[PDB]
Structures are given as C-alpha cells and as structure tokens.
Design an enzyme around this catalytic site. Structure first.
Site, PDB file in Angstrom:
ATOM      1  N   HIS B 262      37.248   8.684  10.255  1.00 22.02           N
ATOM      2  CA  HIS B 262      38.072   7.779   9.417  1.00 22.02           C
ATOM      3  C   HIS B 262      37.605   6.333   9.546  1.00 22.02           C
ATOM      4  CE1 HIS B 262      41.106   6.408   6.920  1.00 22.02           C
ATOM      5  NE2 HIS B 262      42.200   6.642   7.630  1.00 22.02           N
ATOM      6  N   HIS B 303      27.988   6.260  -0.878  1.00 26.23           N
ATOM      7  CA  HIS B 303      29.405   6.526  -0.642  1.00 26.23           C
ATOM      8  C   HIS B 303      29.783   7.861  -1.295  1.00 26.23           C
ATOM      9  CE1 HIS B 303      33.576   5.519   0.255  1.00 26.23           C
ATOM     10  NE2 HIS B 303      33.174   4.367   0.761  1.00 26.23           N
ATOM     11  N   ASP B 360      30.499  -1.020   4.304  1.00 29.16           N
ATOM     12  CA  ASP B 360      30.500  -0.758   5.747  1.00 29.16           C
ATOM     13  C   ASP B 360      29.270  -1.335   6.453  1.00 29.16           C
ATOM     14  OD1 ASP B 360      32.955   1.089   6.112  1.00 29.16           O
ATOM     15  OD2 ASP B 360      31.848   2.073   4.484  1.00 29.16           O
TER      16      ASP B 360
END
EC number: 2.3.3.16
Lengths: 425, 424, 53
Positions: B262, B303, B360
């Site tokens: 997560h 992604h 990220d």
C-alpha cells in the site's frame, strides 16, 4: 461445474462461474464484472464473499457454529481454550505431545517487555481499556518487526504464539493500571485462565490460589468467543493484512473495530439494562415497558439476530453461570434481579414465542461481573479471546495466494469543474 | 430505472436493481442475493462497490483524478493543502472568511498534550516510525473520547480538525525522537508546510524555512490527500462502521498503509537506486530490468491504474526540478536518478511500454533531497492521507450506515464429533 | 517571605498549565509581577505575545 448468466439489459449477457463449498450456500464469481464495465453494489458486504475459508462455519437458522468441523458446544464441554487455539491455528486437535509443546511455547512468551510498562504512563488511568489496548499492542509492532518476515510461516507461527501469550498479561496490566495497583507478572505453574485471574486480582501483598470453578468458567468464555467467522473486526484484520502489514498492527486494527459499540458492547448493554431496572421490586414495570412497542425500552441479551431459534452456546453458558453463582452466592441485588429476569423470560409465553431466550452475552456479562471484572473491561476480555481467531484468519489468507484488497464505490458527486480562484468566491 | 436479471441455472431467475451514478460505471444491487441463498465471490472486493461516495472520483484509462469535481492537477497548481482539506471535508471550496476560520482552528489544535511525550519513551528510538504512529494516534483515542459523540456532526468536525492539526506535530516528534534530538513545538506564524519542516529540522537555532521546499512539501501533501477507496481508506470505513472512535479508525488506516504493498513505493524506488549504486552501471541494470527472465524491474515507472499518464506526474516533475535547482543534486544517487529519468523518457522501449517516471519516483527523490529519511516516507504519506481517511469516515457516518459483516466460502471439514485424545 | 512571594505565581501557573496538558512556562525578568503571572499562565513556547497593560 455450474455457470450463471447475468443479463444487465443495458449490456449483453455475461457468464459468471458459480462456485460451491464443502457446506453452506453456493457463490457466484463476480471478478469478471469490472471487465464488462460494472460493479456489484453491497453496503456492508452482507451478500459479498470476501474469501475462501476453512476455519469457522456458521448456520444461524439451524443453530450451528463449528470450528474445523467441531461444534462449539462440544469443544466448550470437553476441550480447553489452548486446545481450541491449537485447533483454530493448525486445523486439527493436538496429540499430548503437540499439546505439551504448544502450551510450553505459550508459557514461554507470556512475559511482556519491561519497556511497555512506561507506555501505560502515557495514558490517563481513567482512559478506556480498549483505547489502551489499541495503543499498547499497536506499539508491540515496533518490538517484533525487524526479524518478522510476513511471508515466512515460522514467523507467522511465532507471531501468533506471542499474541495469544501476551494478550492476557497486557489486559491484566490495563486493569491493574486503571486501579492504581502494581502490575502483576505471569506464573508458569498456573494454566491460561488461572494465570489471567491471578494477574487480574492477586497482588504482591498476598498471592492466594485461584478458584477452579471461576478459572474453568473464564476458560469457556474464552472458548465461546475464540472466533465467529467473518465480521467487522476479523475482516478489518484481513483487509489491513492484505497490504503486507505487520500482524500486531493488524490485530490493533481489529481491536479498534471491536471497540465499536455495535460489534462488541452486548455485555455492557445488558448491564446498562439492569442498571435501568435498578431493583427487583420494579421488574414487572420494565417488562411491560419492554413489551410496549411504543416504548424505546427493550430487553438486552435476549434472542439473537443470527441464531434466531437457539444459540448452541446458550446451554453451556447457563450451566457455567449457575455454577459460578453457586460458589459466589448472588450477593449482588443486580445479579439477583438478573436471574429473576431470566426465570421470567424462560417461563413467559410472550418471550418464549418471540424466541427471546437469555443469550451468551446475557450470561457472560453476569459471570464476568460476578467474578469481579468491571464493565469497562468486558470488551477487552472479548478482544483477549478473539485474538486467536483474528490471527488464524490472517494466517489463512497469507498462507493462501492473496491480492491487496481495493474495494470500489458508486460516485454520486459533482461533475468535472474548473478551479475558481479565491478572489472569485 | 434499469433492472438486471440474474439466472443462476439451479435456482429461478432473480431481479437485481441496477443503479447508476453521476459518473463512472453502473452498479448492480446484490443485497437481495442472501435472500435467494447465494453470495457473490470477490477476492479483494475488486468488482464490489462498498458504498456511495461523492468525495473522490478516478478513471485511470482517461488519466482522471478529481476531488469534489476539481481535477488534482488544478488544485496542486493553484490551491494549497489546507484549502484542499477544506474541499475534501466540506464539499466545496472556501470563501476567504471560511478559509480564515478553518486555518485558524487548525492552528488552534496543532499543539499536542504533554502526556503524549512520555508515550514515546515506551519505544526504542530505532523503532519503525509507522509503528510509533500507529501506537501514538491509537492512544489519542483515550484523550478525545469521553465528550466524543460519534453521531454528532460537531464532534465529527472537531475530531477531523484535531487530526489534521496534530498529525504533523506527531510525525515531527517521531523523527526528533529517532534522532535523539529535543522535540519541537509548532509556530502560529508559519503555514502548514513551513511549520512541518520547522518542527522536523529546526532546533531550540531557529532559522527560516525555504519557500521552495515548503511549497514542494505542500504539493506532495495535496497529491496524497485522498485516492478513492483503497486498503487503508476502506479499513477506516470498515472499522468505523461498528461505531468505533475516529482516532482508533485512523490508527487502523495507518496499520494498513504501513503494508509494503500500500505505502512503500517511495521506499522501493530508493532501494532500486541503492541496487544500481553508481551512474557507471546504469545501462547494466537497464538491460537487467528489460530482461524478462531477471527478477529486476524499474521502480516508480508506469502505474497499474493510470496506464497512459498520471495527471500528477507533470506537477511532480516541475517540483522535483525546482527543488533540485535550489539544493544542487549534491548526492550521486540523485544524479543517478535524474539520468535514469532522462533515459526512461527518451528511450523507445520505455516510451512504448508507458513506463514514465511517476509521482512515487519524483516524490521519493524530493523527500530524500530535502532531508527526510526513507523510514519516514510512509509517515509523510499517512500525514497527507489523514484528511482523506477522516473525510471518508465523515461521509460514511453522515449517511445511513450499517455494521458490515462480509461473507465467506467455506471449504473446511463437514460437522464432526470431538475425537478423544486417544484417536488423535 | 521573599521566596514565597516570588515562587507562588510560578507554581500557580504550573498548576494551570498542567491541568491543561500544556508545557509549563518559566518567568521573565523583563516583565512586572502581574505581567509575568499572566505570561506564565496563558503564553506558550509556541508564541510569546505581549501582555495587556
């Protein structure tokens, strides 16, 4: 083997594989839905199956609750809590050798790290036990994390043992702290239940022996709360755990969920009812007050939303309650009141026909109160017992092939719109 | 309006009402299933809608993420974190009056109860920040519970404010504690982001905060504010449905987020750069990644939802370049990272595979560059997401909820009597 | 007598700051008796703003 056709009207028909289990209803695989550009809608997941399991099966209509195939009433009547723990964790009942070794390990892990004592000093003594538990075992993560490989079954095993062993010691520390008494250490010469009661009520002032009746009653209470299939707390543990989260942290999530009045506050509710009654003299008053559809008053701890006809645990709980009160001798007028209310409910036609029988929660509330546990702790005792269930369900899913849970939603909000700057409002 | 017929083959047909929303796909009401003696099967709930929501909408294919209708890129470019917080909580953007009052309240709740300081002393200084957070804010329950009426919207409101205000203060305390430095207090003369960086890095010399770094941080918070239904968000909802204390539910969220799957992308991308080590052997590890047979793959590229492009990526690139403009890319791992980025963007394989440098990747680099250690990355995530979690909790409770008992598929043994110690 | 007259305000302040769960404040030699008391009572290490005359 079987298939299920779903026709959406707006879309063309879709083939959904319908899967059956060892027992219970069949299930319709809806994982293909997102491909066709739809979801299912299920507030509270009441018609959605999260997973496969082989731990606990329930059928409320039939009055059936069984762990690894074994009925709850049989386990409660025959085996002990640690034997039941072994069953839930490993899938079969232990040999004497397996039992010896398991109990040994559990006794090895019972002591808690001295650092944690200073943790409690960060709380108010009047703070809610479940808050304290949620914090404390949430902090355990920090102590057992560096070695811990979530994917290694040996680490999972030792984590489960650690939890099952420490939870009683922690629960005891919460109580002893709230009281302002000195916190007690475990004893290897006492069994699980005995040890708990010792840590709870004994002092360094006088270390007197534990009643076998009370200890046994407590043990059964633990057995009867060990696991209850998928529920708010259990499923919270699973959902959190799905991300690859530390087990102790996941259990902390479970405690947070269980704390919720709806999930684990029946024992407290039934006591509040007895407080509302107050005296035996005005039992009839509140009986009619309950029976009055117009009056918000209703009896607590009578009947069950799942086990509508009868709870298989109810009988054993009755036996245990009567056996405990035999030893302690109903000194309390609220206990006296409670047993009269029970008498009435059982021998009254209205309650009989409504299936409003005195349930596990009613009896357990009375027992816990009778043996000295304050109402605040009731939910902590629940958490104590359920821990093994939670970690068993966590172990199961992790041992299987799992996918990080990411539920969907139904959007009913605004539609794309540009940003209006602060001076245009 | 529309209906959906489900024919199970064994049972007779059943009528399921199909409900539509303001946007996104239609949904098929399966609450009637348990009546007919069946369940749906959905490992991970990936095709099951838990609830109605009007907070955040996502469409990965189209590269769309919007809070209350407002696109994430617009908010990131224009508004600040606290304005975005107000949006997520209240449903519309604030006036100057509403804004003033909201920021005021948040500044009022920023200080933490002195008792909590002694809490940290119950941890090892080398303990995991997320463990510390999970414990600490789990204990906050005890401090804000007695008054707290979960059903009263005023209590919900003040609980949300308390959380949004305190989380930075706590996150700072974790860092300062791990270091063995004295814990810092907030300052009412500094904005949210500034305050955070102050509490993090300043000492009892109190030097001023870079507006570039502060703004970059604020943007990072905005871009992690909420992300629809997910492990953590849904954990908060599930826990909360029992009528559980909000702070406890947030603690559940932190527990869930801690999970590597997560919230560990920022950490993962850094471990990749550690594995590379030097610029000299970038090509080596590029081919090592491209090798299907080799377990090595690039982290922070592409992604699983935003397949074509992430709308946040552009803004994050801007911020990264802007931060490194001020700091100077002193670090060889940062140098390495920007070269890897250059390659990935101007390379045909990565271009065609839609393996673009993502939010990220950029955020990991920024956080590292401005001094945050990798351990804290997930705590910064939690910090930002808090407002999202509590907003989803607020929504759930403001609606007519239900406890929430998920079902299972039993594949264990059939009912059997207790086999005596001798048989086993 | 001096010790008592001097310390009592500081202690009284500490009681209040403690009940609140706020960090306890120290005195300031650049403030008069009354000012000092109000400072120790209501000001923080967060923001040390001036006292109303």
């Amino acid at each position: 083997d079987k298939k299920a056709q779903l026709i959406i009207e707006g879309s063309a028909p879709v083939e959904l594989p319908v899967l059956s289990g060892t027992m219970g209803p069949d299930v319709v695989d809806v994982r293909g839905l997102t491909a066709t550009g739809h979801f299912t809608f299920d507030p509270g997941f009441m018609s959605t199956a999260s997973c496969e399991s082989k731990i606990t099966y329930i059928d409320g209509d039939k009055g059936v609750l069984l762990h690894r195939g074994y009925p709850i009433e049989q386990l409660a009547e025959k085996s002990d809590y640690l034997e039941t723990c072994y069953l839930l964790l490993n899938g079969e009942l232990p040999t004497a050798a397996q039992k010896e070794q398991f109990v040994g390990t559990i006794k090895n892990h019972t002591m808690v790290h001295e650092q944690l004592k200073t943790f409690f000093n960060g709380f108010r003594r009047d703070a809610h036990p479940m808050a304290v538990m949620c914090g404390v075992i949430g902090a355990l993560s920090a102590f057992y994390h560096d070695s811990l490989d979530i994917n290694n079954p040996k680490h999972r095993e030792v984590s489960a043992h650690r939890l099952i062993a420490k939870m009683p010691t922690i629960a005891a520390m919460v109580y002893k702290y709230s009281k302002g008494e000195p916190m007690m250490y475990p004893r290897n010469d006492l069994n699980y239940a005995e040890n708990f009661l010792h840590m709870m009520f004994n002092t360094p002032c006088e270390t007197k022996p534990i009643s076998p009746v009370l200890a046994k009653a407590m043990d059964r209470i633990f057995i009867l709360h060990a696991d209850h299939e998928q529920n708010a707390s259990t499923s919270t543990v699973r959902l959190a755990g799905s991300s690859g989260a530390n087990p102790f942290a996941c259990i902390a999530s479970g405690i947070a969920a269980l704390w919720g009045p709806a999930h684990g506050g029946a024992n407290e509710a039934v006591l509040r009812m007895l407080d509302e009654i107050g005296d035996v003299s005005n039992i009839d008053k509140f009986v009619e007050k309950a029976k009055d559809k117009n009056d918000p008053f209703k009896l607590m701890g009578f009947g069950h939303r799942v086990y509508k006809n009868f709870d298989p645990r109810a009988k054993v709980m009755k036996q245990t309650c009567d056996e405990v009160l035999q030893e302690l001798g109903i000194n309390d007028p609220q206990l006296e009141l409670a047993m009269k209310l029970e008498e009435i409910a059982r021998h009254d036609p209205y309650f009989v026909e409504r299936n409003l029988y005195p349930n596990v929660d009613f009896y357990s509330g009375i027992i816990l109160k009778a043996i000295g546990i304050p109402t605040s702790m009731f939910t902590v005792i629940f958490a104590l017992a359920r821990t093994v269930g939670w970690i068993s369900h966590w172990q199961e899913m992790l041992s299987g092939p799992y996918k990080i849970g990411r539920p969907r939603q139904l959007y009913t909000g605004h539609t794309q719109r540009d940003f209006t700057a602060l001076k245009d409002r």
